[PDB]
Design a protein around this nucleic acid. Structure first.
Lengths: 152, 150
RNA sequence: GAGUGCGACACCUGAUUCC
DNA sequence: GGAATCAGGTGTCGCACTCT
């Protein structure tokens, strides 16, 4: 178990073997600490892609948190897409019929709508962790997602 | 060792620990009791790619020392072979960017190797997994020997 | 509306060598 | 298993132009 001031630190990550190929396998992973009862690594239900696993691994961590009555959180993910989406983009997407900058429709709307819904009632600091650069937290969350993508 | 007027040479690098004291070696073999057969220490940052590349570099300097311009080069470093026979064309065109849009790490090394190849007619031969070729084994022996000497 | 670049962070597939 | 390294891909977005 780890913390920064009053915020408990959590790591999330998604993965997907054969992303954009013929047989995609996507998984989610959240790491709270060594041997933490809350660490999970499971198979991502639905459309298999890296983007959804990254968004959905972040959703899982928040659900778990509410489950522990946690309201302050530092969420580390190596997914700028997830971050930018939830902390910038969704705001504008809501005032424009969910439309890309190329007049078309935002592909992960349901993933971001599900995410934003979870963020109600949560002071969360979305911090980017560079992937594959020695951050135990992020390697483990990646380890956990790979294991989860090896499932159901 | 000659394939016609083309003379044959074997090159190889090595680097164990590739974490603590990455030690890198360079070896170039021309044949039984040849005055230019050498095993020496890789200068600079120690990696396997750098030793394989500078092993080729070393051999080409030696060829020139012998007024050789048609050279057949044997190495098991497909990375070296690919950078020099076909990737450098694109890197000099795209500002030395990788397919992932990042910077070519061994840029310095390939530029030096490319410089040495001006005026050289060189055939790059990949020596596979494992074959006989005492040439490759010798070159290997040379590299591991040069692996220790600052 | 159609399209083309560019940037960024991920997610991969593959290959050879060095351990 | 890992490192050193590269080539080809998709997943997705914003940003910046141009319509033969």
């Amino acid at each position: 178990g780890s913390h920064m001031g009053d915020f408990v630190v959590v790591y999330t990550d998604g993965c997907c073997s054969s992303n954009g190929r013929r047989r995609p396998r996507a998984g989610i992973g959240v790491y709270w600490g060594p041997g933490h009862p809350l660490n999970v690594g499971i198979r991502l239900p639905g459309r298999q892609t890296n983007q959804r696993a990254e968004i959905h691994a972040a959703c899982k961590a928040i659900e778990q948190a509410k489950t522990q009555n946690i309201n302050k959180l530092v969420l580390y993910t190596n997914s700028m897409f997830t971050i930018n989406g939830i902390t910038n983009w969704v705001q504008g997407w809501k005032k424009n019929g969910w439309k890309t900058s190329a007049g078309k429709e935002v592909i992960n709307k349901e993933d971001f709508v599900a995410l934003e819904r979870l963020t109600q009632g949560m002071d969360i600091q979305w911090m980017h962790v560079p992937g594959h650069s020695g951050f135990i937290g992020n390697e483990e969350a990646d380890r956990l997602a790979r294991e989860g993508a090896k499932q159901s």
